[PDB]
Amino acid sequence: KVFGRCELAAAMKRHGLDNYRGYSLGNWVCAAKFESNFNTQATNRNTDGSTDYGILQINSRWWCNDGRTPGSRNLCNIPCSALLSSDITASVNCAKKIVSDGNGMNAWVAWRNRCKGTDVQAWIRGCRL
């Protein structure tokens, strides 16, 4: 599923991500925009052989099991496939563990490089929320 901007904002809110660990909804929308262009089915191989999965590009190195990332962890206790679903529940539950891990949203390198410090409220502007 390719989400629309306000549509994703509303799903993120429904799943309790808005201001989770202090990060406003526009931060989450911005991270999703630049991680996956809002496409739940996005996947991207890393040079180290891990893979990033879903709307928030969650990495098999730590967070999910794909069976092909030697020595990796599965801290969200889920198959990486569960992160590609049209329903964002698994992605949201895992992102909550990620953003609690110590470095906040800096875990998402595109959030750090493209969202952090910017006018993130633009991302939810005009949305019936």
Residue type, 81: S
Interacting residues with Cl ion between 50 and 69 (CB under 5 A): 65, 67, 69
CA–CA dist 37, 48 (Å, integer):
23
User: Quick one: residue 63, left, alpha or beta (phi over 0 = left, psi -120 to 50 = alpha)?
Assistant: alpha
CA–CA dist 93, 122 (Å, integer):
25
- 7 has catalytic annotation: no
**Options 52, 66, 87, 119, the catalytic residue:** 52
Task: Return the one option of Na ion, Cl ion, none that residue 88 interacts with (CB less than 5 to 8 A, by type).
Answer: Cl ion
Site residue total, Cl ion (CB under 5 A)? 16
Coil, strand, or helix at residue 114? helix
Closest contact distance (angstroms) between CB of 58 and Na ion is: 10
Q: Does 121 bind Cl ion (CB under 5 A)?
A: yes
Task: Return the one option of Na ion, Cl ion, none that residue 81 interacts with (CB less than 5 to 8 A, by type).
Answer: none
